[PDB]
Amino acid sequence: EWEALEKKLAALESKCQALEKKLQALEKKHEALEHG
């Protein structure tokens, strides 16, 4: 019920955090390509 949504929401935040890290690593690759 109320905690089932809490569990789903915590899981989604965790997945979004992991995607953000992968996106930051891609941004860093372009910075390395642009300054070298």
Added chain:
Amino acid sequence: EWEALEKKLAALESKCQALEKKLQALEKKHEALEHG
């Protein structure tokens, strides 16, 4: 109410899944550039 959050949460998961796929395709492009 309770199902309105359920609907919002299902929509967000669907959008995050679609972003993940686009991020995987970008990662694959860098792998292809790095090994060719």
Added chain:
Amino acid sequence: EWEALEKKLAALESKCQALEKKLQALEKKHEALEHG
């Protein structure tokens, strides 16, 4: 309670929107590299 999840969900959507924009800018960089 009910509005605490609403607040968390609105915050997450806002973070996902900002990641989507950064992902679109990365896609645009590859398009510029592929046609120039």
